[PDB]
Amino acid sequence: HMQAEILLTLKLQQKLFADPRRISLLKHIALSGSISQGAKDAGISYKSAWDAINEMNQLSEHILVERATGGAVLTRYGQRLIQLYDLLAQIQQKAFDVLSDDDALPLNSLLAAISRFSLQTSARNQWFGTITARDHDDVQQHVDVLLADGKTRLKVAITAQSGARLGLDEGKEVLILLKAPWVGITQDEAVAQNADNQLPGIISHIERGAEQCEVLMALPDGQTLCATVPVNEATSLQQGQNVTAYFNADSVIIATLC
Amino acid sequence: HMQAEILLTLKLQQKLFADPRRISLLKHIALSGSISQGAKDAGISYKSAWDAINEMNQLSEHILVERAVLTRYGQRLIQLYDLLAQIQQKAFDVLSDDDALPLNSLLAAISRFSLQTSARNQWFGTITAQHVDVLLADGKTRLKVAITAQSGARLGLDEGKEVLILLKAPWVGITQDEAVAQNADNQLPGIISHIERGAEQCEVLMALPDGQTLCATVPVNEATSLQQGQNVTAYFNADSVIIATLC
Numbered sequence: 001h002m003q004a005e006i007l008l009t010l011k012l013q014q015k016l017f018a019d020p021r022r023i024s025l026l027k028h029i030a031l032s033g034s035i036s037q038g039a040k041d042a043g044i045s046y047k048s049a050w051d052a053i054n055e056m057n058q059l060s061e062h063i064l065v066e067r068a069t070g071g072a073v074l075t076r077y078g079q080r081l082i083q084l085y086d087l088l089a090q091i092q093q094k095a096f097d098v099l100s101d102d103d104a105l106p107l108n109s110l111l112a113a114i115s116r117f118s119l120q121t122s123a124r125n126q127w128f129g130t131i132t133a134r135d136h137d138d139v140q141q142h143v144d145v146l147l148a149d150g151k152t153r154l155k156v157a158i159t160a161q162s163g164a165r166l167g168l169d170e171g172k173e174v175l176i177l178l179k180a181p182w183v184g185i186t187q188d189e190a191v192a193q194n195a196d197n198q199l200p201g202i203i204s205h206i207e208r209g210a211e212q213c214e215v216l217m218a219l220p221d222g223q224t225l226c227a228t229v230p231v232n233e234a235t236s237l238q239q240g241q242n243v244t245a246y247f248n249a250d251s252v253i254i255a256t257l258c
Numbered sequence: 259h260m261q262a263e264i265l266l267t268l269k270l271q272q273k274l275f276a277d278p279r280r281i282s283l284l285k286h287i288a289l290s291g292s293i294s295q296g297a298k299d300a301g302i303s304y305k306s307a308w309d310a311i312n313e314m315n316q317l318s319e320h321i322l323v324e325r326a327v328l329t330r331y332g333q334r335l336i337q338l339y340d341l342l343a344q345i346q347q348k349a350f351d352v353l354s355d356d357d358a359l360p361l362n363s364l365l366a367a368i369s370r371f372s373l374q375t376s377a378r379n380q381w382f383g384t385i386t387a388q389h390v391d392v393l394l395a396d397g398k399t400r401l402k403v404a405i406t407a408q409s410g411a412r413l414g415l416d417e418g419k420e421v422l423i424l425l426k427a428p429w430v431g432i433t434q435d436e437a438v439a440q441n442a443d444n445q446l447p448g449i450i451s452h453i454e455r456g457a458e459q460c461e462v463l464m465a466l467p468d469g470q471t472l473c474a475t476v477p478v479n480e481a482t483s484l485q486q487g488q489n490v491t492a493y494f495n496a497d498s499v500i501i502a503t504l505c
């Protein structure tokens with residue numbers, strides 16, 4: 001790791017609205033209770049502090065700082081700006097970490113940012129992919145999805161109507177939500193071959209309990225698959241070996257932005 | 259709404275790593291296929307273009323430009339800049355929303371109304387007090403959701419945490435028999451508002467409290483006696499539900 005230092009500049013009406021120094025000023029105003037001590041604490045003159053505050057008020061059409069009921073306090077909008085800025089900065093810092101350690105998902109994608117940094121589901125699989133052209137000339141009641149390698153195919157059961165409401169045409173980004181107990185793991189291709197979906201991979205981790213065994217497997221694009229299988233059936237399974245996961249097309253829920 | 263934009267500079271080792279001008283340089287290099295034309299197209303001198311490339315390579319510990327084409331790392335750095343250009347209007351719309359509650363997560367705010375799923379039953383609720391108890395947004399219908407303590411910590415399920423509840427229609431049973439419904443983990447009584455019988459499957463829509471309508475898809479021979487208007491019980495296992503949070 002090498003953490004990046006993030007500097008954002010927000011502009012409104014083609015004018016500088018908020019940069020690092022202005023946000024620092026607003027924070028020090030919140031911490032100190034005054035414009036004069038806050039300016040001193042932020043390293044800026046009193047005049048330049050009021051010059052910023054006045055311009056920020058005019059541009060945003062809101063009041064950022066007010067006298068307290070006297071000290072200076074941040075208003076609802078002043079606090080909302082600091083929070084928006086700091087959260088946006090945090091998204092960039094997290095995105096930079098993803099650049100640094102790498103992954104197969106697009107880094108320009110909103111859904112992929114949502115999946116990596118915000119969304120958590122009880123289903124232990126949450127895979128990014130994209131809708132692709134159907135793989136047959138006849139219309140069937142599912143959509144076809146490519147994983148982030150742009151090669152690994154999956155089919156998901158859905159109605160034409162449902163598909164239309166969610167905008168599922170070629171290229172639409174989606175997440176695949178799939179519970180782990182609904183994913184089988186096998187060393188017998190024929191067994192997987194009677195399933196709707198077959199996803200080859202290598203076991204990355206195994207954990208056995210009394211009734212169930214958890215298997216984690218790297219998908220071909222680097223995403224992780226999680227399957228829960230009855231302990232009796234996981235008896236031969238072992239880390240580092242070749243395996244195919246399999247599941248039905250109607251076991252998946254698609255998530256997507258509309 | 260007003261013209262609004264967000265500019266990003268990244269520093270590494272207390273030094274300049276990326277800024278709009280360096281990202282422009284990279285994009286022009288990709289398009290033109292050369293450092294010298296890319297510098298010309300980006301309005302910087304040739305030696306300044308090499309200074310920037312060499313500094314970016316050194317501070318990052320990666321190569322951004324190869325023999326010219328961008329590397330994957332260079333393309334991905336441009337994608338990081340493009341993520342911000344993509345979310346900027348949504349972020350300014352979140353800032354300008356005077357009627358919204360205080361901002362907790364920016365990705366949750368931008369996702370709340372846009373994220374949609376293929377499950378026909380998609381409900382909001384909150385955690386109340388093996389599993390968790392959920393109270394739907396109507397404040398009355400309670401659900402039991404199977405989830406390990408570990409996953410509950412990963413989702414951050416604390417009292418009052420907002421959750422998204424997902425249930426496909428075919429995971430839901432419909433019964434007019436209380437002796438069947440009583441042994442289910444979750445029981446949701448309601449009036450059947452519509453029935454559609456197909457050759458193998460029957461879609462049942464049932465009224466939920468707020469005008470929410472539960473959808474269930476049942477094998478046709480199990481719906482033979484059912485009628486529009488009848489009070490019925492929708493039932494499902496606690497482990498059939500998927501619950502999600504946005505942090």
Ligand code: NI
Nearest residue numbers: 134135144155
């Ligand atoms: Ni297909």
